Short mmCIF file of all heavy atoms in Angstrom, two decimals:
data_model
loop_
_atom_site.label_atom_id
_atom_site.label_comp_id
_atom_site.label_asym_id
_atom_site.label_seq_id
_atom_site.Cartn_x
_atom_site.Cartn_y
_atom_site.Cartn_z
N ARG F 7 123.90 84.74 90.75
CA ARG F 7 124.04 86.18 90.75
C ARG F 7 123.10 86.80 91.77
O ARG F 7 121.99 86.32 91.99
CB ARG F 7 123.75 86.75 89.36
CG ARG F 7 124.53 86.09 88.24
CD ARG F 7 124.46 86.91 86.96
NE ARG F 7 125.28 88.11 87.04
CZ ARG F 7 126.52 88.20 86.58
NH1 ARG F 7 127.11 87.18 85.98
NH2 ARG F 7 127.18 89.35 86.72
N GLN F 8 123.57 87.88 92.42
CA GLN F 8 122.75 88.52 93.44
C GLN F 8 121.55 89.23 92.83
O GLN F 8 120.43 89.11 93.34
CB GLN F 8 123.60 89.51 94.25
CG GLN F 8 122.80 90.48 95.11
CD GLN F 8 122.17 89.83 96.33
OE1 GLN F 8 122.09 88.60 96.44
NE2 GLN F 8 121.71 90.65 97.26
N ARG F 9 121.76 89.97 91.74
CA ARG F 9 120.66 90.74 91.17
C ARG F 9 119.59 89.84 90.57
O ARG F 9 118.42 90.24 90.49
CB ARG F 9 121.19 91.71 90.11
CG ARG F 9 122.24 91.14 89.19
CD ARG F 9 122.83 92.23 88.31
NE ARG F 9 123.90 91.74 87.45
CZ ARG F 9 124.57 92.50 86.59
NH1 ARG F 9 124.32 93.79 86.46
NH2 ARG F 9 125.52 91.94 85.85
N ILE F 10 119.95 88.63 90.15
CA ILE F 10 118.94 87.68 89.69
C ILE F 10 118.10 87.20 90.87
O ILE F 10 116.88 87.00 90.73
CB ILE F 10 119.61 86.51 88.94
CG1 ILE F 10 120.27 87.01 87.67
CG2 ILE F 10 118.59 85.44 88.61
CD1 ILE F 10 119.32 87.69 86.72
N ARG F 11 118.72 87.01 92.03
CA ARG F 11 117.97 86.59 93.21
C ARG F 11 116.93 87.62 93.60
O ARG F 11 115.81 87.28 93.99
CB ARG F 11 118.92 86.33 94.38
CG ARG F 11 119.89 85.19 94.18
CD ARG F 11 119.23 83.84 94.38
NE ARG F 11 120.19 82.75 94.30
CZ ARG F 11 120.82 82.22 95.33
NH1 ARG F 11 120.61 82.66 96.56
NH2 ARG F 11 121.68 81.23 95.13
N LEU F 12 117.28 88.91 93.51
CA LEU F 12 116.35 89.97 93.89
C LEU F 12 115.14 89.99 92.97
O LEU F 12 114.01 90.19 93.42
CB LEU F 12 117.06 91.32 93.88
CG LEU F 12 117.73 91.78 95.18
CD1 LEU F 12 118.68 90.73 95.73
CD2 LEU F 12 118.45 93.09 94.97
N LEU F 13 115.36 89.81 91.66
CA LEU F 13 114.24 89.81 90.72
C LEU F 13 113.30 88.65 90.97
O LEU F 13 112.08 88.81 90.92
CB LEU F 13 114.76 89.78 89.28
CG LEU F 13 114.95 91.12 88.58
CD1 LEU F 13 115.94 92.01 89.32
CD2 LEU F 13 115.41 90.90 87.14
N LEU F 14 113.85 87.46 91.25
CA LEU F 14 113.00 86.32 91.55
C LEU F 14 112.30 86.47 92.89
O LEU F 14 111.24 85.86 93.10
CB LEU F 14 113.82 85.03 91.52
CG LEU F 14 113.93 84.30 90.17
CD1 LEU F 14 114.65 85.14 89.14
CD2 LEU F 14 114.63 82.96 90.36
N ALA F 15 112.86 87.25 93.80
CA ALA F 15 112.20 87.50 95.08
C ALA F 15 110.89 88.26 94.87
O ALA F 15 109.90 87.99 95.55
CB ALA F 15 113.13 88.26 96.02
N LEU F 16 110.89 89.23 93.95
CA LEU F 16 109.66 89.95 93.64
C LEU F 16 108.60 89.01 93.07
O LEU F 16 107.42 89.10 93.43
CB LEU F 16 109.95 91.09 92.67
CG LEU F 16 110.93 92.16 93.14
CD1 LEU F 16 111.28 93.10 91.99
CD2 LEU F 16 110.35 92.94 94.31
N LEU F 17 109.00 88.12 92.16
CA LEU F 17 108.04 87.21 91.54
C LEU F 17 107.48 86.23 92.56
O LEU F 17 106.27 85.98 92.59
CB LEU F 17 108.70 86.46 90.38
CG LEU F 17 108.64 87.12 89.00
CD1 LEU F 17 107.20 87.45 88.63
CD2 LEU F 17 109.51 88.37 88.94
N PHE F 18 108.35 85.65 93.39
CA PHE F 18 107.86 84.71 94.40
C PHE F 18 107.10 85.42 95.51
O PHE F 18 106.14 84.86 96.05
CB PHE F 18 109.03 83.91 94.98
CG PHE F 18 109.45 82.76 94.13
CD1 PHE F 18 110.54 82.86 93.29
CD2 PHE F 18 108.75 81.56 94.16
CE1 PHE F 18 110.93 81.80 92.50
CE2 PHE F 18 109.14 80.50 93.38
CZ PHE F 18 110.23 80.62 92.54
N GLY F 19 107.50 86.64 95.86
CA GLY F 19 106.74 87.40 96.84
C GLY F 19 105.35 87.76 96.35
O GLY F 19 104.38 87.69 97.10
N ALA F 20 105.24 88.15 95.08
CA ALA F 20 103.94 88.51 94.53
C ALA F 20 103.01 87.31 94.44
O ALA F 20 101.79 87.47 94.53
CB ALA F 20 104.11 89.14 93.15
N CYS F 21 103.57 86.11 94.28
CA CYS F 21 102.74 84.91 94.21
C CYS F 21 102.00 84.63 95.51
O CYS F 21 101.00 83.91 95.50
CB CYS F 21 103.60 83.70 93.82
SG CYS F 21 102.68 82.20 93.45
N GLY F 22 102.47 85.18 96.63
CA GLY F 22 101.78 84.99 97.89
C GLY F 22 100.42 85.65 97.93
O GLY F 22 99.49 85.12 98.55
N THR F 23 100.28 86.81 97.28
CA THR F 23 99.01 87.53 97.29
C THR F 23 97.92 86.78 96.54
O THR F 23 96.74 87.12 96.69
CB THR F 23 99.18 88.91 96.68
OG1 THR F 23 99.07 88.83 95.26
CG2 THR F 23 100.55 89.46 97.03
N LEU F 24 98.27 85.78 95.74
CA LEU F 24 97.30 84.95 95.04
C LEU F 24 96.74 83.83 95.90
O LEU F 24 96.21 82.86 95.36
CB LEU F 24 97.93 84.37 93.76
CG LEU F 24 97.93 85.23 92.50
CD1 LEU F 24 98.85 86.44 92.64
CD2 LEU F 24 98.33 84.39 91.30
N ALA F 25 96.86 83.94 97.22
CA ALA F 25 96.35 82.93 98.13
C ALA F 25 95.22 83.44 99.01
O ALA F 25 94.62 82.64 99.74
CB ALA F 25 97.48 82.39 99.01
N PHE F 26 94.91 84.73 98.95
CA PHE F 26 93.93 85.31 99.85
C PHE F 26 92.54 85.30 99.20
O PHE F 26 92.33 84.67 98.17
CB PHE F 26 94.40 86.70 100.27
CG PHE F 26 95.74 86.69 100.95
CD1 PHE F 26 96.87 87.16 100.31
CD2 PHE F 26 95.87 86.18 102.23
CE1 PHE F 26 98.10 87.14 100.94
CE2 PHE F 26 97.10 86.15 102.86
CZ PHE F 26 98.21 86.63 102.21
N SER F 27 91.59 86.00 99.81
CA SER F 27 90.18 85.83 99.45
C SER F 27 89.87 86.15 97.99
O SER F 27 89.16 85.35 97.35
CB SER F 27 89.30 86.66 100.38
OG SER F 27 87.93 86.46 100.10
N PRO F 28 90.32 87.26 97.40
CA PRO F 28 89.97 87.52 96.00
C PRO F 28 90.48 86.46 95.04
O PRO F 28 89.82 86.17 94.03
CB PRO F 28 90.60 88.89 95.72
CG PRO F 28 91.69 89.00 96.72
CD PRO F 28 91.17 88.34 97.94
N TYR F 29 91.64 85.86 95.32
CA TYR F 29 92.21 84.79 94.51
C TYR F 29 92.36 83.57 95.41
O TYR F 29 93.42 83.33 95.99
CB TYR F 29 93.55 85.21 93.92
CG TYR F 29 93.61 86.65 93.46
CD1 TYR F 29 94.16 87.63 94.27
CD2 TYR F 29 93.13 87.02 92.22
CE1 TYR F 29 94.22 88.94 93.86
CE2 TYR F 29 93.18 88.33 91.80
CZ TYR F 29 93.73 89.29 92.63
OH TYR F 29 93.79 90.60 92.21
N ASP F 30 91.29 82.78 95.51
CA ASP F 30 91.26 81.63 96.42
C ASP F 30 92.10 80.49 95.84
O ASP F 30 91.59 79.47 95.36
CB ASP F 30 89.83 81.19 96.68
CG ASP F 30 89.04 82.22 97.47
OD1 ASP F 30 89.59 82.78 98.44
OD2 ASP F 30 87.87 82.47 97.12
N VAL F 31 93.42 80.67 95.90
CA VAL F 31 94.38 79.66 95.46
C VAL F 31 95.33 79.44 96.63
O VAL F 31 96.36 80.12 96.75
CB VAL F 31 95.14 80.07 94.20
CG1 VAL F 31 96.03 78.94 93.72
CG2 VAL F 31 94.17 80.49 93.10
N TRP F 32 95.01 78.48 97.50
CA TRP F 32 95.81 78.23 98.69
C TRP F 32 97.22 77.69 98.41
O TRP F 32 98.13 77.99 99.19
CB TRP F 32 95.07 77.29 99.65
CG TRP F 32 94.95 75.87 99.21
CD1 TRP F 32 93.90 75.31 98.54
CD2 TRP F 32 95.90 74.82 99.43
NE1 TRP F 32 94.15 73.97 98.32
CE2 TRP F 32 95.37 73.65 98.85
CE3 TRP F 32 97.15 74.76 100.04
CZ2 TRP F 32 96.04 72.43 98.88
CZ3 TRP F 32 97.82 73.55 100.07
CH2 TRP F 32 97.27 72.41 99.49
N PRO F 33 97.47 76.91 97.35
CA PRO F 33 98.84 76.47 97.09
C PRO F 33 99.78 77.57 96.61
O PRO F 33 100.98 77.32 96.48
CB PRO F 33 98.66 75.41 95.99
CG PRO F 33 97.44 75.81 95.30
CD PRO F 33 96.54 76.28 96.39
N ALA F 34 99.28 78.77 96.36
CA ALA F 34 100.12 79.89 95.96
C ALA F 34 100.85 80.52 97.14
O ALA F 34 101.69 81.40 96.94
CB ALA F 34 99.29 80.96 95.25
N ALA F 35 100.54 80.10 98.37
CA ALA F 35 101.25 80.54 99.55
C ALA F 35 102.48 79.69 99.83
O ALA F 35 103.51 80.21 100.27
CB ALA F 35 100.32 80.52 100.77
#
Side-chain angles (χ1 to χ4, degrees):
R7 308 194 74 96
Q8 166 73 346
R9 43 188 177 180
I10 295 301
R11 295 283 185 93
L12 270 53
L13 267 59
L14 270 63
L16 300 171
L17 272 305
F18 279 99
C21 189
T23 85
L24 276 68
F26 301 107
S27 184
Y29 321 98
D30 292 318
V31 185
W32 71 266

